[PDB]
């Protein structure tokens, strides 16, 4: 992927998310070669602009530097705008024939990103599967989340955008997978005897998805009113995940196989019940400095009485053989303590207590973000003159996240984007609770800023069969 | 035992044993006060000295310092010495009226240390028990190695001493043991999940307990013609260290039971046969520098012709459901490349390959000297583009081992000394081998000085099935 010319289409390149997180990713892409030596960058929306004003705009977001001043101009030498709407054929046709009117732009593989709003896909990738279909090199999509609301949401848009293109080209993006400790994970469990054999129904005794960051939803509160934190990230990173802990052992690396057993895992794993879940929302904090003191609720663009959670608990079980009977946890939140996204793997109690009770379940800590790292939390004799052991922590282990998995998304590894299939297992996972929700408007529980999150959620854990320390 | 008085009787006080390596230990035992506070030094021997003497023939060896050149006096305010000889009641009468002349003598605790030639236990320990008992505390004894020569002179030995005394006050010491990363392998075999259910047939690839010195036998090379490296280091150190890795789950942590499972794995040992071991003998270097240019059989003092071997392979299998078939290798020397105690845990490969044959088994090191340290070498991914992991070096992890190993006799705790029935079973073992050396005089394979040693034991390793990286 460094001979054959690639072109990076932003679809609404006046938007927001290309201002602030597609541009600068780029960019940084661009400084240090990582993308194709020939890669063109083409930004698409309606209102009338020139590059000289996307650099205007986009400059004090790239954080550039003097040294690579060069390699900024080098960057928008490749840069363009094709200004149109989004449904209308005479713009796509004129995209097409700008698109074209570049070297071998009908040879060049392009890469569509779709920044746009999410009401607008039904349109946009018909218009795509009509027109801007290349015949020579491949056509792969970058669809953001959500991708629908609910069951019969999501199996129309799967339906059509299957109907448009195979399932080799649709990427479903995940912003916040880490793609480094969520590969790490895969290393760990199968180049290990040492982990292999306990990772059954006998040893693992729970099994804790945490997804925490310190901010809340500045700004953009009406979006997340509609959505939720369930269909915001615990049900597509959460949920991935959870894949990528309780599943199979893959008949190879590749990322089909990967898929396949993710796709039988969530088929082996029965309907969520109201019982099996617990959702709160934030609010101001009197003792606040900063934005702690204003609440969700309190935020001018969120509608009045409005009943959207942003925090999820919810456990699973993965019931076949090799994890029958066993806890799956999952935590997600905003505007929580601590930045942080780990997963934690407490193992049962050795049979037999040898050691007068001082034994603790042993942990398996992943931490995809921030500090990279993994490490175990196992016990063994402190040094002095006795016996008694005590738990210790010892450590078991470069672009960002986000502009890795758009390195994958050229590279075609498709290895960590959910599946038609897939997402269809995990809309019905959820479908008696969001409908329930969407019929009854249940409150969520208000809960602290800054704090842990509800006590709900350890009282979950504490009943499924978690041990806090 | 900070309050009752104790009495470390060193019969053989004369000897080099002692002059060498039992003052020195008890004085820096009594420098930090890890003796009890009212303990009495009682130095026997042949020879007529005084406590002038011994200070002036064990100062060198001391490394004392004028920061507690004070704790000097100190020490040697504690000591006293008494001549006579060994196989006559009157000097044996007299010892007793020398400690009984002293602070409670009768209540104070004895603790001999048998430091005297191996010819003469059969009568100093009939005369101990016949006048050296005490009839209000704890009488205990230290016999030093060898214990015999074969089956019938071990048996008789131990009949001897179990009718003069119970098992519980029969301390068969071991000076190379560790009683550090010794007492680290139980807590971390039975206080992790990650290593307890996978530790079995069907995941340990096999098991190597090595141990090496850098070091010849100079100066004293009469001394290993008689025994040889199976009696000296490989019947009680290395046997011990399969103990601990092969026994079962005791139903406690007391010695009783840890030396019942020590007792039922042994029992659950086939006899060895000629073609599980291997046998050498090092040679000088013609390269060498110092005490290398000389091998054992150049040593004045070694007879001519001597077939004793200084490398000693062994392989056992523990025959039972936990252990049916897999390999336990041995490997004990003198004068090795490297001063080295390490058991070394190999997992089986994972049923199935994923990452393209690239696995390496998991490793757990854990050695004993030098650099005390557990490390697994296990793999995980290298950081970068690439879905590979690589073996990467992963740590785990005071006065020295014989220090403590004193204090052990001192508490009473026998964790780590062989009991009657287990060295019944450890000579029974290696009966037949030792038989048919003895019968047929085999010669041992020449092998370098302050090498590796000779490849006879590395493809030893290699037929049992032991990996290579």
Same mark, same amino acid.
């Given at each position: 992927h460094q001979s054959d010319t690639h072109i990076f289409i932003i679809m609404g390149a006046s938007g927001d998310l290309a201002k602030k997180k597609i541009y600068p990713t780029i960019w940084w892409l661009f400084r240090d070669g990582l993308l194709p030596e020939n890669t063109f960058i083409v930004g698409y929306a309606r209102s009338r602009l020139t590059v000289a004003d996307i650099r205007k705009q986009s400059e004090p977001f790239f954080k550039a530097t003097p040294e690579e001043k060069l390699k900024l101009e080098d960057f928008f030498a490749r840069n363009s705008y094709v200004a149109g709407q989004?449904? /209308?054929a005479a713009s796509y046709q004129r995209l097409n024939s700008h698109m074209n009117a570049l070297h071998l732009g009908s040879q060049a593989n392009r890469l569509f990103y779709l920044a746009l709003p999410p009401t607008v896909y039904e349109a946009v990738t018909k218009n795509i599967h009509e027109s801007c279909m290349s015949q020579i090199g491949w056509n792969r999509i970058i669809v953001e989340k959500p991708?629908?609301?609910?069951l019969q949401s999501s199996d129309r848009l799967s339906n059509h955008i299957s109907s448009l293109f195979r399932? /080799?080209?649709?990427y479903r993006i995940?912003?916040?997978?880490?793609?480094?400790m969520v590969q790490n994970l895969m290393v760990l469990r199968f180049a290990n005897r040492i982990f292999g054999p306990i990772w059954n129904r006998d040893n693992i005794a729970c099994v804790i998805l945490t997804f925490k960051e310190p901010f809340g939803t500045e700004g953009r509160g009406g979006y997340f009113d509609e959505f939720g934190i369930i269909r915001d990230v615990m049900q597509n990173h959460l949920l991935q995940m959870l894949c990528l802990v309780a599943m199979e052992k893959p008949a190879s690396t590749n990322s089909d196989d990967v898929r396949d057993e993710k796709v039988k895992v969530l088929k082996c794993i029965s309907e969520v019940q109201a019982n099996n879940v617990v959702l709160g929302q934030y609010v101001g904090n009197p003792d606040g400095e900063g934005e702690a003191t204003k609440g969700y609720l309190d935020d001018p663009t969120v509608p009045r009485g409005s009943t959207t959670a942003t925090f999820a608990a919810v456990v699973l079980y993965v019931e076949n053989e090799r994890w029958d009977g066993v806890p799956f946890i999952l935590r997600c939140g905003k505007a929580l303590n601590e930045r942080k996204a780990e997963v934690r793997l407490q193992f049962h109690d050795v049979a037999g207590d040898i050691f007068h009770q001082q034994c603790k379940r042993n942990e398996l800590v992943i931490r995809v973000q921030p500090n990279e790292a993994v490490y175990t939390k196992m016990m063994t004799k402190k040094p002095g003159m006795f016996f008694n052991p005590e738990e210790s922590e010892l450590d078991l282990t470069l672009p960002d996240a986000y502009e890795r998995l758009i390195l994958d998304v050229f590279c075609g590894s498709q290895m960590h984007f959910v599946r038609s299939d897939e997402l269809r297992e995990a809309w019905r996972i959820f479908t008696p609770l969001l409908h329930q929700i969407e019929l009854e408007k249940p409150k969520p529980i208000p809960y602290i800023y800054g704090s842990r999150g509800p006590t709900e959620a350890d009282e979950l854990m504490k009943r499924v069969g978690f041990q806090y320390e």
């Open positions: 989004y449904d /209308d991708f629908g609301r609910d399932e /080799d080209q649709i995940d912003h916040y997978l880490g793609k480094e």
